[PDB]
Structure formats: C-alpha cells, structure tokens
mmCIF file of C-alpha atoms in Angstrom:
data_model
loop_
_atom_site.group_PDB
_atom_site.id
_atom_site.type_symbol
_atom_site.label_atom_id
_atom_site.label_comp_id
_atom_site.label_asym_id
_atom_site.label_seq_id
_atom_site.Cartn_x
_atom_site.Cartn_y
_atom_site.Cartn_z
ATOM 1 C CA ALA A 3 25.017 -25.612 88.284
ATOM 2 C CA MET A 4 27.241 -23.387 86.128
ATOM 3 C CA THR A 5 28.202 -26.368 83.933
ATOM 4 C CA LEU A 6 29.005 -29.000 86.580
ATOM 5 C CA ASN A 7 29.802 -32.704 86.212
ATOM 6 C CA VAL A 8 27.833 -34.953 88.579
ATOM 7 C CA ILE A 9 28.236 -38.655 89.397
ATOM 8 C CA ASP A 10 25.386 -40.115 91.459
ATOM 9 C CA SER A 11 27.044 -42.583 93.829
ATOM 10 C CA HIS A 12 23.732 -44.005 95.122
ATOM 11 C CA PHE A 13 20.439 -44.421 93.261
ATOM 12 C CA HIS A 14 17.759 -47.079 92.830
ATOM 13 C CA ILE A 15 15.419 -48.282 90.092
ATOM 14 C CA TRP A 16 12.636 -50.852 90.295
ATOM 15 C CA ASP A 17 9.403 -52.027 88.684
ATOM 16 C CA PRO A 18 6.665 -53.077 91.151
ATOM 17 C CA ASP A 19 5.036 -55.387 88.575
ATOM 18 C CA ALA A 20 8.037 -57.406 87.371
ATOM 19 C CA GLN A 21 9.804 -57.292 90.760
ATOM 20 C CA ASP A 22 8.733 -58.170 94.304
ATOM 21 C CA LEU A 23 9.813 -55.613 96.909
ATOM 22 C CA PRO A 24 8.345 -56.427 100.349
ATOM 23 C CA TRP A 25 9.469 -53.169 101.985
ATOM 24 C CA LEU A 26 7.348 -51.264 99.437
ATOM 25 C CA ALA A 27 4.160 -52.157 101.332
ATOM 26 C CA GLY A 28 2.729 -49.251 103.292
ATOM 27 C CA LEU A 29 4.559 -46.804 100.981
ATOM 28 C CA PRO A 30 2.100 -45.983 98.169
ATOM 29 C CA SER A 31 4.259 -42.981 97.220
ATOM 30 C CA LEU A 32 6.949 -45.319 95.835
ATOM 31 C CA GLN A 33 4.787 -48.061 94.256
ATOM 32 C CA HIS A 34 5.630 -46.895 90.739
ATOM 33 C CA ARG A 35 8.048 -47.868 87.985
ATOM 34 C CA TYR A 36 11.326 -45.929 88.186
ATOM 35 C CA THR A 37 13.840 -46.022 85.332
ATOM 36 C CA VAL A 38 17.296 -44.553 84.816
ATOM 37 C CA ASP A 39 15.775 -42.189 82.237
ATOM 38 C CA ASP A 40 13.558 -40.699 84.956
ATOM 39 C CA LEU A 41 16.673 -39.867 86.980
ATOM 40 C CA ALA A 42 18.357 -38.403 83.891
ATOM 41 C CA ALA A 43 15.392 -36.074 83.341
ATOM 42 C CA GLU A 44 15.798 -34.728 86.883
ATOM 43 C CA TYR A 45 19.464 -33.878 86.297
ATOM 44 C CA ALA A 46 18.399 -32.251 83.020
ATOM 45 C CA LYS A 47 16.171 -29.811 84.918
ATOM 46 C CA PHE A 48 19.141 -28.925 87.140
ATOM 47 C CA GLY A 49 21.393 -28.042 84.198
ATOM 48 C CA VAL A 50 24.200 -30.368 85.283
ATOM 49 C CA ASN A 51 26.159 -32.787 83.095
ATOM 50 C CA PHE A 52 24.964 -36.173 84.367
ATOM 51 C CA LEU A 53 27.887 -38.569 83.879
ATOM 52 C CA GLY A 54 25.998 -41.594 85.232
ATOM 53 C CA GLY A 55 25.072 -43.234 88.497
ATOM 54 C CA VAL A 56 25.965 -46.124 90.785
ATOM 55 C CA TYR A 57 23.112 -48.590 91.207
ATOM 56 C CA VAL A 58 22.544 -50.051 94.675
ATOM 57 C CA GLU A 59 20.515 -53.190 95.347
ATOM 58 C CA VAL A 60 16.863 -52.481 96.124
ATOM 59 C CA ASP A 61 16.487 -55.382 98.613
ATOM 60 C CA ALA A 62 14.444 -57.415 96.142
ATOM 61 C CA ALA A 63 12.865 -60.744 97.039
ATOM 62 C CA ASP A 64 14.511 -62.573 94.111
ATOM 63 C CA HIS A 65 18.151 -61.486 94.006
ATOM 64 C CA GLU A 66 18.767 -63.638 90.922
ATOM 65 C CA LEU A 67 16.060 -61.690 89.085
ATOM 66 C CA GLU A 68 17.694 -58.419 90.150
ATOM 67 C CA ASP A 69 21.036 -59.648 88.792
ATOM 68 C CA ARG A 70 19.485 -60.478 85.411
ATOM 69 C CA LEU A 71 17.393 -57.305 85.126
ATOM 70 C CA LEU A 72 20.523 -55.185 85.596
ATOM 71 C CA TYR A 73 22.597 -57.044 83.027
ATOM 72 C CA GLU A 74 19.801 -56.589 80.480
ATOM 73 C CA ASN A 75 19.664 -52.877 81.423
ATOM 74 C CA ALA A 76 22.581 -51.786 79.230
ATOM 75 C CA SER A 77 21.963 -48.068 79.777
ATOM 76 C CA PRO A 78 25.306 -46.200 79.656
ATOM 77 C CA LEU A 79 24.163 -44.135 82.659
ATOM 78 C CA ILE A 80 24.583 -47.180 84.952
ATOM 79 C CA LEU A 81 28.279 -46.806 85.744
ATOM 80 C CA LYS A 82 28.515 -49.380 88.550
ATOM 81 C CA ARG A 83 26.207 -52.040 89.987
ATOM 82 C CA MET A 84 26.161 -52.809 93.712
ATOM 83 C CA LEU A 85 24.274 -56.097 93.974
ATOM 84 C CA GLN A 86 23.473 -57.935 97.190
ATOM 85 C CA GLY A 87 25.243 -60.857 98.822
ATOM 86 C CA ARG A 88 26.480 -62.377 102.063
ATOM 87 C CA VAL A 89 30.083 -61.441 102.837
ATOM 88 C CA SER A 90 32.335 -64.503 103.111
ATOM 89 C CA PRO A 91 35.578 -65.756 101.517
ATOM 90 C CA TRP A 92 33.370 -68.230 99.620
ATOM 91 C CA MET A 93 30.564 -65.824 98.673
ATOM 92 C CA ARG A 94 28.477 -65.999 95.500
ATOM 93 C CA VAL A 95 29.131 -62.763 93.581
ATOM 94 C CA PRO A 96 27.251 -61.917 90.360
ATOM 95 C CA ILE A 97 29.659 -62.001 87.435
ATOM 96 C CA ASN A 98 28.355 -58.588 86.294
ATOM 97 C CA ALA A 99 28.515 -56.998 89.765
ATOM 98 C CA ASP A 100 31.032 -54.245 90.501
ATOM 99 C CA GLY A 101 30.483 -54.476 94.266
ATOM 100 C CA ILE A 102 28.434 -56.022 97.050
ATOM 101 C CA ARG A 103 26.076 -54.688 99.714
ATOM 102 C CA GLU A 104 24.909 -56.882 102.581
ATOM 103 C CA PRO A 105 21.738 -55.448 104.173
ATOM 104 C CA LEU A 106 22.918 -55.349 107.790
ATOM 105 C CA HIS A 107 19.505 -55.517 109.500
ATOM 106 C CA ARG A 113 23.394 -59.250 115.386
ATOM 107 C CA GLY A 114 27.152 -58.785 115.631
ATOM 108 C CA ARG A 115 27.633 -59.664 111.972
ATOM 109 C CA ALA A 116 30.657 -57.388 111.515
ATOM 110 C CA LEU A 117 32.527 -59.242 114.286
ATOM 111 C CA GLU A 118 32.293 -62.688 112.679
ATOM 112 C CA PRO A 119 35.603 -63.944 111.224
ATOM 113 C CA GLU A 120 33.996 -65.000 107.937
ATOM 114 C CA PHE A 121 32.890 -61.386 107.479
ATOM 115 C CA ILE A 122 36.447 -60.137 108.040
ATOM 116 C CA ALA A 123 37.880 -62.834 105.768
ATOM 117 C CA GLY A 124 35.224 -61.978 103.190
ATOM 118 C CA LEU A 125 36.384 -58.359 103.170
ATOM 119 C CA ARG A 126 39.909 -59.464 102.240
ATOM 120 C CA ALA A 127 38.529 -61.604 99.406
ATOM 121 C CA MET A 128 36.568 -58.665 97.970
ATOM 122 C CA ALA A 129 39.610 -56.430 98.396
ATOM 123 C CA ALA A 130 41.773 -58.775 96.319
ATOM 124 C CA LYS A 131 39.028 -58.790 93.650
ATOM 125 C CA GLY A 132 38.519 -55.022 93.480
ATOM 126 C CA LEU A 133 35.022 -55.210 94.980
ATOM 127 C CA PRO A 134 34.012 -52.282 97.219
ATOM 128 C CA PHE A 135 31.613 -52.904 100.088
ATOM 129 C CA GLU A 136 28.479 -50.821 100.671
ATOM 130 C CA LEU A 137 27.913 -50.345 104.414
ATOM 131 C CA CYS A 138 24.306 -49.620 105.428
ATOM 132 C CA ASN A 139 23.723 -50.333 109.113
ATOM 133 C CA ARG A 140 21.943 -49.180 112.271
ATOM 134 C CA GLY A 141 22.837 -46.161 114.384
ATOM 135 C CA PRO A 142 24.427 -47.691 117.492
ATOM 136 C CA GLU A 143 26.196 -50.489 115.582
ATOM 137 C CA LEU A 144 28.738 -48.143 113.953
ATOM 138 C CA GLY A 145 31.246 -48.960 116.699
ATOM 139 C CA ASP A 146 31.680 -52.577 115.619
ATOM 140 C CA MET A 147 31.891 -51.515 111.958
ATOM 141 C CA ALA A 148 34.955 -49.410 112.732
ATOM 142 C CA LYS A 149 36.793 -52.375 114.261
ATOM 143 C CA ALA A 150 35.765 -54.617 111.356
ATOM 144 C CA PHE A 151 37.153 -52.426 108.564
ATOM 145 C CA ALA A 152 40.186 -51.476 110.667
ATOM 146 C CA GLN A 153 41.418 -55.062 110.287
ATOM 147 C CA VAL A 154 40.941 -54.850 106.500
ATOM 148 C CA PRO A 155 42.253 -51.416 105.410
ATOM 149 C CA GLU A 156 42.716 -52.655 101.824
ATOM 150 C CA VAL A 157 38.970 -53.034 101.153
ATOM 151 C CA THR A 158 37.000 -50.034 99.897
ATOM 152 C CA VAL A 159 34.097 -49.331 102.267
ATOM 153 C CA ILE A 160 31.389 -46.771 101.470
ATOM 154 C CA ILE A 161 29.381 -45.550 104.467
ATOM 155 C CA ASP A 162 25.781 -45.220 103.272
ATOM 156 C CA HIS A 163 23.611 -42.278 104.328
ATOM 157 C CA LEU A 164 26.080 -40.627 106.738
ATOM 158 C CA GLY A 165 26.210 -43.834 108.785
ATOM 159 C CA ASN A 166 22.502 -43.606 109.726
ATOM 160 C CA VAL A 167 23.564 -41.836 112.931
ATOM 161 C CA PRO A 168 20.924 -40.218 115.175
ATOM 162 C CA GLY A 169 23.019 -37.128 115.911
ATOM 163 C CA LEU A 170 26.065 -35.910 117.847
ATOM 164 C CA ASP A 171 26.424 -38.988 120.034
ATOM 165 C CA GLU A 172 29.658 -39.521 121.936
ATOM 166 C CA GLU A 173 29.740 -43.081 120.582
ATOM 167 C CA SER A 174 28.774 -42.135 117.017
ATOM 168 C CA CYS A 175 31.327 -39.316 116.773
ATOM 169 C CA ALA A 176 34.027 -41.722 117.970
ATOM 170 C CA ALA A 177 33.049 -44.348 115.389
ATOM 171 C CA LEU A 178 32.859 -41.850 112.518
ATOM 172 C CA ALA A 179 36.313 -40.563 113.488
ATOM 173 C CA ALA A 180 37.843 -44.054 113.420
ATOM 174 C CA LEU A 181 36.441 -44.793 109.956
ATOM 175 C CA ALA A 182 37.775 -41.476 108.635
ATOM 176 C CA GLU A 183 41.277 -42.690 109.558
ATOM 177 C CA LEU A 184 41.070 -45.619 107.108
ATOM 178 C CA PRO A 185 42.726 -45.103 103.702
ATOM 179 C CA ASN A 186 39.865 -46.461 101.546
ATOM 180 C CA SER A 187 36.794 -45.336 103.506
ATOM 181 C CA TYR A 188 34.097 -43.156 101.948
ATOM 182 C CA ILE A 189 30.862 -41.642 103.245
ATOM 183 C CA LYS A 190 27.740 -40.535 101.368
ATOM 184 C CA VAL A 191 25.781 -37.379 102.196
ATOM 185 C CA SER A 192 22.210 -38.634 101.817
ATOM 186 C CA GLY A 193 19.655 -40.754 103.671
ATOM 187 C CA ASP A 194 15.955 -41.488 104.123
ATOM 188 C CA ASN A 195 15.600 -38.027 105.718
ATOM 189 C CA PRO A 196 16.807 -34.512 104.890
ATOM 190 C CA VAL A 197 20.413 -34.355 106.053
ATOM 191 C CA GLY A 198 21.140 -32.363 109.189
ATOM 192 C CA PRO A 199 23.511 -29.400 108.887
ATOM 193 C CA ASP A 200 25.206 -30.431 112.143
ATOM 194 C CA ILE A 201 25.956 -33.959 110.913
ATOM 195 C CA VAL A 202 27.133 -32.800 107.477
ATOM 196 C CA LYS A 203 29.543 -30.238 108.943
ATOM 197 C CA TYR A 204 31.163 -32.785 111.267
ATOM 198 C CA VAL A 205 31.418 -35.368 108.474
ATOM 199 C CA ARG A 206 33.217 -32.984 106.106
ATOM 200 C CA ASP A 207 35.803 -31.990 108.724
ATOM 201 C CA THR A 208 36.756 -35.462 109.961
ATOM 202 C CA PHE A 209 36.555 -37.285 106.617
ATOM 203 C CA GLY A 210 37.967 -34.472 104.483
ATOM 204 C CA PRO A 211 37.083 -33.248 100.990
ATOM 205 C CA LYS A 212 38.619 -36.317 99.298
ATOM 206 C CA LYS A 213 36.463 -39.029 100.930
ATOM 207 C CA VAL A 214 32.940 -37.587 100.649
ATOM 208 C CA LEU A 215 30.594 -38.726 97.873
ATOM 209 C CA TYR A 216 27.545 -36.979 96.450
ATOM 210 C CA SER A 217 24.474 -39.196 96.793
ATOM 211 C CA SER A 218 20.852 -38.514 95.846
ATOM 212 C CA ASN A 219 19.233 -41.696 97.246
ATOM 213 C CA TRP A 220 16.716 -41.351 94.416
ATOM 214 C CA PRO A 221 13.832 -42.061 94.366
ATOM 215 C CA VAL A 222 13.689 -42.646 98.130
ATOM 216 C CA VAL A 223 14.613 -38.973 98.625
ATOM 217 C CA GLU A 224 11.100 -38.126 97.363
ATOM 218 C CA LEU A 225 9.573 -39.671 100.519
ATOM 219 C CA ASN A 226 10.557 -37.317 103.362
ATOM 220 C CA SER A 227 12.032 -34.617 101.102
ATOM 221 C CA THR A 228 12.485 -33.751 97.416
ATOM 222 C CA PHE A 229 15.287 -34.280 94.914
ATOM 223 C CA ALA A 230 15.209 -30.552 94.140
ATOM 224 C CA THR A 231 15.306 -29.774 97.867
ATOM 225 C CA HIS A 232 18.136 -32.248 98.489
ATOM 226 C CA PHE A 233 20.162 -31.342 95.394
ATOM 227 C CA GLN A 234 19.924 -27.613 96.123
ATOM 228 C CA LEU A 235 21.021 -28.122 99.735
ATOM 229 C CA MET A 236 24.113 -29.919 98.409
ATOM 230 C CA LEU A 237 24.896 -27.014 96.086
ATOM 231 C CA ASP A 238 24.626 -24.599 99.023
ATOM 232 C CA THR A 239 26.737 -26.722 101.383
ATOM 233 C CA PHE A 240 29.549 -27.840 99.056
ATOM 234 C CA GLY A 241 29.177 -25.563 96.054
ATOM 235 C CA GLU A 242 30.402 -26.620 92.623
ATOM 236 C CA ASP A 243 32.972 -29.020 94.063
ATOM 237 C CA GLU A 244 34.484 -31.364 91.480
ATOM 238 C CA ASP A 245 35.702 -33.800 94.146
ATOM 239 C CA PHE A 246 32.354 -34.055 95.942
ATOM 240 C CA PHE A 247 30.344 -34.444 92.724
ATOM 241 C CA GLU A 248 32.476 -36.757 90.559
ATOM 242 C CA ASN A 249 36.170 -37.069 91.414
ATOM 243 C CA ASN A 250 35.771 -38.836 94.766
ATOM 244 C CA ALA A 251 33.464 -41.399 93.145
ATOM 245 C CA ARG A 252 36.044 -42.072 90.420
ATOM 246 C CA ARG A 253 38.491 -43.259 93.094
ATOM 247 C CA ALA A 254 36.049 -45.077 95.387
ATOM 248 C CA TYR A 255 34.266 -47.088 92.677
ATOM 249 C CA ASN A 256 37.237 -47.010 90.247
ATOM 250 C CA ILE A 257 35.192 -45.322 87.513
ATOM 251 C CA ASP A 258 37.372 -44.921 84.419
#
C-alpha cells in the first residue's frame, strides 16, 4: 500500500429497486444499492491509487436494461464492461460492451457454435469471461485450446474444489494458452494451497487481481481479502494493474 496502482479486474454494481436480480433472494446482506463510488471509497481507505475497475454482468433479468444502465453510467472508474450474451458466430453483442460473459450454469463448451463464436470474438477484440462449475474445467481446456487467439479470463480461480487430479490437469492446460488469464477471487476466501499452485503454473504475467466486490462481503470482507492479496503477492505491479492492461487491452 506504499503508493500502489490497482486495477480491479472483477467487480459488480446493482440497484435492487431499478433492477431485477433473481439470485439476490435469500441473501438479505446484498439487497442494497451498490455504486462505483462505494468501491472507490474502499480503495481510499486502503491508500492505493484506484485506476478503475472492470464491470462484470450481474446476471440481471433484463439484459437490455443492464446494457442501458451501464452506458448511462459514464463514471471514469468503469474501465471495461463485460456484458452477458450467448457465444455464437452470430451473437448479439452490445455496441458499448468491451467483452462477453456467458453464465455457464450441459456440454456447452463442446458445441461447434461455441467454438466458432470464440473465433468471432477474437477477430473483434472481445475477451471472454469464463465462470463455470468445478468438474467442467476439463472441457473448457479443450474448447479454448482450439481457439488460442481469443482472450479467456478464468473467473474465481476456476471455481475448483481443491487439489483434484482432474482440476490440476485442466488448470495446467489452460496455463499453456498464450491469451489465458486467471483471477484470484471467488465467493469464498481463497485457499492458500490453490493460490500457490495457480501462481506457479500460470506465472506472474497471467494472474489478475480481483476483488469480486461486493460479493466478497458475503463469506469474507474486502479488507480481509485485499490484505491477504498484499501478503501473498506484495506490491506487485503486474498482479495489480499491468496484467489487466494486456488481458482487457486497457490503454
């Protein structure tokens, strides 16, 4: 925190009144309005130079409303916008979207229209946000191996359960791709064992800092998560801003 530049590669904002989020039921801790200014105030307490964040789709009921609400949110702190869509070489992409995330709930990654859709996004400069199940990481590796020219960002350390012989083999295959990236975050406090294996196989150039705010305030705390990152990586310029400048092409 001794003057450090930070780029948040994964954060969310929503308003439970204007928007309809079905997954918010049963979670009264998150049924509040979250703005980009609230995230900026957290980075102000930590004494870091917040250079902006990468918005990720909040799985809203009306995706067209989410597209409009994020155009009208002209805050300079929103560096990139990862809106939702269905991957295909004929997919509808928001004209203001910098990338696409398909909520992979189903061998979707093995369908040819998904592979062909990756090539279309690659030719358009659109990175893909990969958020999947634990055991399904094996098929993801074969999918993005056919399209090495698309930028894939593995969300939340791949959502792996632990040191599985199948998960370690899938995470090692993805680390061999030239444009693959992995985020150190998740809906739970990250495990030291998983983080150590991810840093070794992926390397210091393909690991992104991610807060997962404000979901990190469910099973953990932003202060708890952000401090654990400072202890694990230290004041690393690549982990905190430089790797995100190459993954998301942040000028």
